[PDB]
Every structure is written in C-alpha cells, then in structure tokens.
Paper text:
PPARγ is a master regulator of adipose cell differentiation and development. Structurally, PPARγ belongs to the nuclear hormone receptor superfamily. The pharmacological actions of PPARγ agonists are mediated through the PPARγ LBD, which includes the transcriptional AF-2 motif associated with helix 12 of the LBD171819.
In this paper, we identified a novel synthetic compound, VSP-51, which acts as a selectively modulating ligand for PPARγ. Very interestingly, the IC50 and ki values of VSP-51 (IC50 = 22.45 nM, ki = 8.06 nM) and Rosi (IC50 = 137.60 nM, ki = 49.40 nM) indicate that VSP-51 has a more potent binding activity than Rosi. The compound VSP-51-binding pocket of PPARγ is enclosed by residues from helices 3, 4, 5, 6, 7, and 10 and the AF-2 helix as well as residues from the β strand and a loop region between helices 6 and 7. The majority of the pocket residues are hydrophobic residues, similar to the pocket of PPARγ bound to Rosi and other agonists. The most specific feature of VSP-51 in complex with the PPARγ binding pocket is the hydrogen bonding network among the amide group of VSP-51 and the PPARγ residues Ser289 from helix 3, Tyr327 from helix 5, and Lys367 from helix 7. Notably, the amide group of VSP-51 does not interact with those three key residues, His323 at helix 5, His449 at helix 10, and Tyr473 from the AF-2 helix whose interaction with the acidic head groups of TZDs may contribute to the conformation of the receptor related to adverse effects of the TZD drugs. Compared to the PPARγ-Rosi complex structure, the receptor-VSP-51 crystal structure displays slight, but significant, shifts of protein backbone and side chain rotamers of the ligand binding pocket residues, including those of Tyr473, His323 and His449 that make them move toward and form hydrogen bonding between each other as occurs in the apo PPARγ structure. As revealed in the complex structure reported here, VSP-51 does not form hydrogen bonding interactions with the AF-2 helix, which may partly explain why VSP-51 functions as PPARγ partial agonist instead of full agonist. Notably, we also identified an inducible hydrophobic pocket in the VSP-51 complex crystal structure around the C2- and C3-positions of the indole nucleus, surrounded by Arg288 from helix 3, Ile326 and Leu333 from helix 5, and distantly Phe226, and Leu228 from the loop between helices 1 and 2, which also occurs in other PPARγ-ligand complex structures. The existence of this pocket indicates that introducing a proper side group into the indole nucleus of our compound at C2- or/and C3- positions may be a new direction to modify the compound to improve its therapeutic efficacy targeting PPARγ.
Residue numbers in the entry:
A (entry chain A): 207 to 476
B (entry chain B): 141 to 151
Write the structure that this text describes.
Amino acid sequence: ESADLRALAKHLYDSYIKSFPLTKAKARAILTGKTTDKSPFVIYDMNSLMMGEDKIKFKHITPLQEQSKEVAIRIFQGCQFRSVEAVQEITEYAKSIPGFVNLDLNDQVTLLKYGVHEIIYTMLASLMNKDGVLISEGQGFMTREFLKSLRKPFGDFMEPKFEFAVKFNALELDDSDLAIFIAVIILSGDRPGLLNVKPIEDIQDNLLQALELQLKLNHPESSQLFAKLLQKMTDLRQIVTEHVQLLQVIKKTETDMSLHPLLQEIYKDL
Amino acid sequence: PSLLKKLLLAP
Ligand SMILES: O=C(NCc1ccccc1)c1ccc2c(ccn2Cc2ccc(Cl)c(F)c2)c1
C-alpha cells in the first residue's frame, strides 16, 4: 500500500517538474537572493513601471504599453495573459494524473474549469512574499504596495491573494507536497455538472492518502498539517468566489477590458 | 467549441 502511495507521490512530483517551469524552489531561491542570476527588476511605482513594463510577457497585436492609457488595465491584461498560459500548464499536469484522461472528457473539462482558478492561486503563493510577487518568469518583482495603489476597482484585486499567500506560505510546503495537493484539488467530485462523480472520488481518495503519507514523512514535526491543508482548499474556493464578484463589477463599469476566449469559457456560468 | 477540450486533446 504505502509503496504505491510513495510511487504516486514521485510520479506526480516528476510530472509537476515537467509541467511548471517556475517552481517554488526556484522562486524561493530568487526571492531570498540565493541565486547567481541577476536579481529581478522591481516595479514599485509608476516610473519603475515604465522601465520594467516592457519586461512583462504580453503577446498581442500591439505592445502592452498601447493597450490602455490606464495603467491598471495594462497590469490587468498582463495578469490575464499569464493566466492563459497557467491554464495550459495546469492542463498538461492534469493529463499526467493517473486515471484523469480515462474520465469522461466532459468531466475532465469541468474539473479543469473550477479547478484552474484554485490551483493558480495556490501556486501564486509560491511566487509571493509579504511585500510583492515575482512576475515574468521570475525576472521581475511587483510590490504589493504598488498593486494596492491602483485605482478602484483594481486596487483590491491582488490583496486577497497576498493575504491567502501569507497564511499558506506559513505552512512551508515544498514542491513535492504541492504536486500532490494540486492533484487533490483537480480531482474534486463536488464540481457542478459532473457526470460521473464516483470515479473522480475514487481517484481523489487515493491522492488524499498519498498526501497524508507525504506530509507525515516530509513534515514529521508539523502536527495536523494534513488538516490545515484541507481547510486551505476550502479557503481557495472563497478566494475564487470573491474574484469572480470583482470581475463582474469590472465588467459592468469598464468596457475597456477584454477577456481571452479561454478565460471566457472558464468564467461562463461560474 | 471548448478551448479546454482542444488543450486536452493536444499532444
Ligand atoms: O487573478 C488572476 N487570474 C484571473 C484573471 C485575471 C485577470 C483577468 C482574467 C482572469 C491572477 C492574478 C495575478 C497573477 C496571476 C498569475 C500571476 N500573477 C501575478 C502577476 C502580477 C502582476 C502581473 Cl503584471 C502579472 F502579469 C502577474 C493570475
């Protein structure tokens, strides 16, 4: 039993390494100044944003700079572009979770929809400290303060993610822990519209056992870590709910915003 | 047409 659980943990960690280019290990190395690489460009204000701005990954008809006169909208679009690529990464990872691709294809789609926002905020915590967030594949750092200074509605956009990240990072998970945690989140059987719930629940049961074992071995002195982590899954759901509410506000007030069709598919009836 | 489905069916 336990041998298979360990094998499952290792399978998931290897797949995680293949799917996600910027890991927590790499991010923490950068954030702690423990890398040989040139340290990130810091965007803490409007002037540093000009310089740094061309560092944001955005690929479109015109450069990011020309998208809006409003800085908050350009940052918004940057987050959106990253989000699309993050969904692609999570999809590849999900395909590596044993049993997932054998589920009803429509159930695979449903799991990814509801799941991808929760996973994005989990991993986002890997890129954060209490003062800001790594951007552009770790080549940039945007301060929490600067993000908070954006005009409403956009000023409160990132703050709940930072709050979650502070608590979540206090758990000191590493990438092997996270690989299983994320797999657990994807395989939630209570997602709306799931056709076959039981097979999904079966896989999640197995993943949850693997996670429990992983946390006991990797964090022997952290008591009830498993319990604390499960409660975080529920927290993430609340984060997403509030994010969607803000997005609806933005949609009503600002027509200068445009959603990528992939994100539109994800947000529809969600 | 689902773009998620498109990504899932990618190689
Ligand atoms: O809420 C999110 N996605 C959901 C979403 C947002 C916008 C439009 C439609 C859907 C979200 C927010 C922040 C994110 C990510 C991934 C990384 N960061 C950090 C970050 C910070 C600053 C910049 Cl400029 C950047 F490019 C990236 C995802």
